[PDB]
From a paper:
TfR1 is a highly recycling receptor expressed on the surface of various cell types, including myofibers and cardiomyocytes, as well as endothelial cells, where it undergoes constitutive endocytosis to transport transferrin-bound ferric ions into the cell. The biological properties of the transferrin receptor make it an ideal candidate for LICA strategies, where conjugation of ASOs and siRNAs to ligands that bind TfR1 promotes their delivery to skeletal and cardiac muscle cells. Bicycle molecules are ∼2-kDa bicyclic peptides formed through the structural constraint of peptides around a trimeric scaffold via formation of thioether cysteine linkages. Here, through effective combination of phage display and peptide medicinal chemistry, we identified and characterized a bicyclic peptide (Bicycle® molecule BCY17901), with a molecular weight of ∼2 kDa, that binds human TfR1 with high affinity and specificity.
Phage selection screens against human TfR1 identified Bicycle molecules that bound to the cognate receptor with sub-micromolar affinity. Subsequent phage display rounds were used to select Bicycle peptides that do not compete with the natural transferrin ligand. Affinity maturation of the lead Bicycle using natural amino acid substitutions was performed to further increase the potency. From this exercise, two Bicycle molecules sharing a common motif were identified for further exploration, BCY15466 and BCY15468 (top two rows). The crystal structure of human His6-TfR1 (called hereafter human TfR1) in complex with the Bicycle molecule BCY15466 was solved at 2.3 Å resolution and used to optimize the binding of the Bicycle lead to TfR1 (see Supplementary Results). An alanine scan was further performed to determine core residues involved in the interaction with the human TfR1 protein and solvent-facing residues that can be used to fine-tune the Bicycle molecular properties such as stability and solubility. Substitution of Ser1, Pro2, and His5 had minimal effect on binding, and the crystal structure showed them to be mostly solvent exposed. Alanine substitution of Leu6 resulted in a small negative effect on binding of ∼5-fold, as measured by fluorescence polarization (FP), which can be explained by the loss of a set of weak intramolecular interactions with the backbone carbonyl of Asp3. Substituting alanine on any of the remaining positions resulted in significant loss of binding, especially Gly3 substitution was highly detrimental to binding because the presence of a glycine in this position permits the turn of loop 1 and is the only compatible residue, since the substitution to Ala or a different side chain would sterically clash with Ser159 of human TfR1. The crystal structure agreed well with the alanine scan data, and molecular interactions could be interrogated to assist in selecting amino acid substitutions to improve Bicycle properties.
Numbering used by the authors:
A (entry chain A), C (entry chain A): 122 to 757
B (entry chain P), D (entry chain P): 0, 0A, 1 to 7, 7A, 8 to 10, 10A
């Protein structure tokens, strides 16, 4: 069968599959709420596993992890206003929700607003935060980052609220959940799997905060603002009731209590084995767990997982679809605590995944609205994405998704809370995440109002929209597994390299003052460019029929993402080793961060660090070009 | 409304 | 052509090739001495490169590195005896030779003998070494280890001499050279390549000593013993003139001076491309450089490199030899300073080598005597080695090398001074080194008496013996490149795993007291065992003709060595990551080292460390079994 | 005997 045949069969299955019904079913009482490792999470895990069996997939299996999670306990979580002596003035709130991995502690101090708690928000404040409590609005960055930023400026605790403007919620009393681990995975098995075989040694993640953090209602936030002075910058665009700093006599005391529980979590898997190279595979993944009912958070994605696995199984069993490479379907737990189930799988089976898993597709929050189609991914996937948007139609308008020629230059990189992030940044598996989306965040995420009722009321076209999410991901699967080319565009890294060199070129004076040079970086970027041209030439001249020469060429494509994983750092201590998309002092952004500080001239710049960064970034790029180029003896 | 048995879906103290 | 055909053609070439003539030629004045990066090293590099061209190899090329070496300078290197006031009593020696990477310093103190300077030598001393200078005999371990051991017991400097007994040298005045870097590679580019592209950032190897070290003649040592008291344990078996400690009034002052030079070094390469899978290759390697003439140190090995490349090129050009996989021939510089040229190549081209280079054969010091044939290697190579010894004949006796059934259980592991060590321990390339050897060390190593004259006088049969070294390595090459199986025996790791579990079982009480268990390690060893059985079954059922199924199976064989490289440590800070054959706290020996200290009960045992060691060793083994077993979904 | 030009084979001070 040809691409056209497979596209139509998919279109058909799609036309008949019932998306809203699947989502409605996942919102039933047996599955709600479904905090990771809870009875109801387990119930949904068994459902999903049993469905996979019914679909008659090549193989259905499960992994079990025991992970440590700090959760709300029976004691008081409270924020109260306190006169300058400690005497109660007013209880503000006993919040319903919590922030996992918060420090358990009670702290008292001034309250200072820091907008979203970005580094620049902190830079631009007139009020100093040293020794005071911070209040920040949800949005823009993760809770974990908000807290880390605050803690780095010696703040003593954090409050998070949803402002009316950015989050138009009628009910002002609404609670909400999240976590503050600056990381993914079980914080207590950093860089290795949460399996009994490890016997759980003492080991703690650098990403754990050391101050307390708590979510509060808008009601609560307003009560606090009524004890505070200073108009919030209008460029914050928050509500009028916003204020910046506690009045002179007034403190606030934050008390949070939690307990560290060992929790059993389940990842549920099926595979459709490939027909030619079954040992290579794509992975398709969705978070199953959530605080609250999690219709948008987890149900939409889980529904897509199910229907995709079903349709693909029909296509193979009935319409003669023969993918050359395999397809794994993964239903993850403890996504709500930082992609924990996914991360532990990656850490557990890295040796099995290496150069075998060649792409990951995430399904979480694929439907939040209908206005925009937004995507984040490895550059390796951009072309596939482009082709898919040019032939898939918007569910509301009837028009193709590809409206914007320059879309690729506006893509934001995967962030810490997206489960695709570890796939790319840690294991170096090209990954993609995508959504139908508004300009607003979907406001019920992490709340008890994330229900089917709310979702369909807000998105009446849900079924058509979900159908369109499914078609995007299904086309990815087919293009990725069916052909004898991979649809991984290595040439996309040339413009990433240009961007990097261009940014660095701004600091040529600093380089010159240090007696350093950009020649070798320039030269390595040229080597990478030439290596991609040769490879594309080899593809053009290949006997497509000839499976050996096609395997040789394709295996070179399958090493590209990997070779951007820094080989110089400890994967245990710095797991996001990808020099482009990862985190830490080995990345390319970090190198610029440091060098920028030289103009600042504050003794913030670390020259020894920067010299080592430049060396290793240079060689990582050069080494990638060299390897892409062919055999050792053929390098110039 | 969450169901009356919501706690079974919670590892956090309900 | 079949194995029998290829064996005979090799035998023929061997019978006609002139080994002693090649060695004699490498001892000519243009090549002697040939300290790494010297004019004469460069001269020999050009010769070798030009020979490779004459042999018409598929491709001839060179790498250039700039490395930092601390070498003897114009100032005084001296040891003098000094009364308790500092007044000269006697100059002992201005030594001719030096120890590279010694601290430049002048130190005064008592002289205390520590035999060979092993950890146990130090343990068993009655005299404390804290604050005094140590004298040790050459042998048993590397200079670098001697110094590190001494420095760890707060010794202030080191003297090294050749005792008459272990080293029967008529001339008692003979100088000698070595280095004290506890490591390989350029100490100033730890874990990354010495290439201009790095721009040589500030970065220093943990392996550099912080005390001074110097070689001295036996004459010098005897003069010192005549100022010392205490008979040396007779189980040391040193000379009678030996003594243990300086007399009460007498100190010795060591002065060493050196300078850190940037040196250009050359690695020279040729390849014979393979006919079927040319992108996979074996590497054959020999040190070209030496302090002094280095006939045994470097010339024998270099001669073998040359003749091997020539013979194999004839076999291909003339007798229709068609290796499926390629063969690289490498002539390394700065081996005398710690496998520097080889290490920098490994660090430079790791991305290109990964799962492409599948074995390394070292040729250095392959001929030192005629009594014994000794070998050190990856277990993966034992079977190939066995087969080779059973069909190659001793050059003196006419008998097969395979005399001992239990030989495999007596093999010592590669050590820091052998260039195969980094191939295995750092890049996870199975490696082998071998020699015709006496029970004695060849005494002229590192001296000006390492000449052709001495070698042939000592080994009259040199040519036949070299012919036999060449046949061993040639058979390895053919078995490794010619067939459709690799001759890499993964099953050999089962007994390595048994040994490990057996040793650990001795400490079951300690494990029990800690609330720990051995079940998972036991279970992981069983998984590894079962995975090897299945793989061997798959080999047995394979259509050998079927190149795809044979490639799939063989690629699993080519990941075995790699999967024993710890994925948890920084390859920059701990380059010998192989958990069996490497160095540091991530290895399996290290785990036992720590646990042994618990019985000792001195607070030397680190329990948090041991818990983390056990976890990661367990998962590294489990992960290796899992990967060997097949696809992710197929793991039990 | 090393040749009279031994120093050309030495990066160490001769
Ligand atoms: C793997 O570890 C988990 C957690 O340590 C074990 O489950 C716990 O076992 C203890 C002791 O029997 C119980 O008291 C706990 O209730 C269990 N914890 C849970 C479910 O969170 C489990 O038994 C271990 N599995 C093995 C050794 O096979
Ligand atoms: C600047 O960066 C360097 C390099 O990362 C830091 O140096 C390391 O410091 C640790 C302990 O502080 C040592 O154990 C390492 O060996 C150092 N590495 C190197 C290459 O020097 C240094 O601490 C930083 N200094 C400043 C200004 O913060
Ligand atoms: C690569 O680095 C080496 C060593 O830094 C450079 O060679 C040195 O260049 C300086 C400046 O011209 C000379 O004074 C030295 O004598 C050279 N050192 C040697 C040979 O040890 C070399 O030029 C650099 N190569 C480049 C930039 O292509
Ligand atoms: C025992 O071993 C542990 C684990 O290796 C050592 O702990 C590390 O210490 C460094 C600084 O000393 C910290 O930065 C690391 O985070 C520690 N790791 C862990 C897991 O604790 C410890 O120092 C050793 N202690 C003794 C007894 O020497
Ligand atoms: C403990 C409890 O009942 N809740 C209310 N929530 C609902 O979704 C009904 C949220 N929640 C959990 O998800 C555990 C806490
Ligand atoms: C500087 C010098 O002449 N020598 C003597 N050596 C000989 O081999 C003749 C040893 N040596 C070097 O190898 C540099 C020092
Ligand atoms: Ca983990
Ligand atoms: Ca190096």
């Amino acid at each position: 069968l040809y691409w056209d045949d497979l596209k139509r069969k998919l279109s058909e299955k799609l036309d008949s599959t019932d998306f809203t019904g699947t989502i409605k079913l996942l919102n039933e009482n047996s599955y709600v709420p479904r905090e990771a490792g809870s009875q109801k999470d387990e119930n949904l895990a068994l459902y999903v596993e049993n469905q996979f069996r019914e679909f008659k997939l090549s193989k259905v299996w499960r992994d079990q992890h025991f992970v440590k999670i700090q959760v709300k306990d029976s004691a008081q979580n409270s924020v109260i206003i306190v006169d300058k002596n400690g005497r109660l003035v007013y209880l503000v709130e006993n919040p319903g929700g919590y922030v996992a991995y918060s420090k358990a502690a009670t702290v008292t101090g001034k309250l200072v607003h820091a907008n979203f708690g970005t580094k620049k928000d902190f830079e631009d404040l007139y009020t100093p935060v040293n020794g005071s409590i911070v209040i920040v609005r949800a949005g823009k960055i993760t809770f974990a980052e908000k807290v880390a930023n605050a803690e780095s400026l010696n703040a003593i605790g954090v409050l998070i609220y949803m402002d009316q403007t950015k989050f138009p919620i009628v009910n002002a009393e609404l609670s909400f959940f999240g976590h503050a681990h600056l990381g993914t995975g079980d914080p207590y098995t950093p860089g290795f799997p949460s399996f009994n075989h490890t016997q759980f040694p003492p080991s703690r993640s650098s990403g754990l905060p050391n101050i307390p953090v708590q979510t509060i209602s808008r009601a609560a936030a307003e009560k606090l603002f009524g004890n505070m002075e200073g108009d919030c910058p209008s460029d914050w665009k928050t509500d009028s009731t916003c204020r910046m700093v506690t009045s002179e006599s007034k403190n606030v005391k934050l008390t949070v209590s939690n307990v560290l529980k060992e929790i059993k979590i389940l990842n549920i898997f099926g595979v459709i084995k490939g027909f030619v190279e079954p040992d290579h595979y794509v992975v398709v993944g969705a978070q199953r767990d959530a605080w609250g009912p999690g219709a948008a958070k987890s149900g939409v994605g889980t529904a897509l997982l199910l229907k995709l696995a079903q349709m693909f199984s029909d296509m193979v069993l009935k319409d003669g679809f023969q993918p050359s490479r395999s397809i794994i379907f993964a239903s993850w737990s403890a996504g709500d605590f930082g992609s924990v189930g996914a991360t532990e799988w990656l850490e557990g089976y890295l040796s099995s995944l290496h150069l075998k898993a060649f792409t990951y597709i995430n399904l979480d929050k694929a439907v939040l609205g209908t206005s925009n189609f937004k995507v984040s991914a490895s550059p390796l996937l951009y072309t596939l994405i482009e082709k898919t948007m040019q032939n898939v139609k918007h569910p509301v308008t009837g028009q193709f998704l590809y409206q914007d020629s320059n879309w690729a230059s506006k893509v934001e990189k995967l962030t810490l809370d997206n489960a695709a992030f570890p796939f790319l940044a840690y294991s170096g598996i090209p990954a993609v995440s995508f959504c139908f989306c508004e300009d607003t965040d979907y406001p019920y995420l992490g709340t008890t109002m994330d229900t089917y009722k709310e979702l369909i009321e807000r998105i009446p076209e849900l079924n058509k929209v979900a159908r369109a999410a499914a078609e995007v991901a299904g086309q990815f699967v087919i293009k990725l597994t069916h052909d004898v080319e991979l649809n991984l565009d290595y040439e996309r890294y040339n413009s990433q390299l240009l961007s990097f060199v261009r940014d660095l070129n701004q600091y040529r004076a600093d380089i010159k003052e240090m007696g350093l040079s950009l020649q070798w970086l320039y030269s390595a970027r040229g080597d990478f460019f030439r290596a991609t041209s040769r490879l594309t030439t080899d593809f053009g001249n290949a006997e497509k029929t000839d499976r050996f020469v096609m395997k040789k060429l394709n295996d070179r494509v399958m090493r590209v993402e990997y070779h951007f994983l820094s080989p110089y750092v400890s994967p245990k201590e710095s797991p996001f080793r990808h020099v482009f998309w990862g985190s830490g002092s080995h990345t390319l952004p970090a190198l610029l961060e440091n060098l920028k500080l030289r103009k600042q001239n504050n003794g913030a710049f670390n020259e020894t660090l920067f010299r080592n960064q430049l060396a290793l970034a240079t060689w990582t790029i050069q080494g990638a070009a060299n390897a892409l180029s062919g055999d050792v003896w053929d390098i110039d | 409304a969450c169901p009356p048995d919501a706690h079974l879906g919670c590892i956090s103290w309900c």
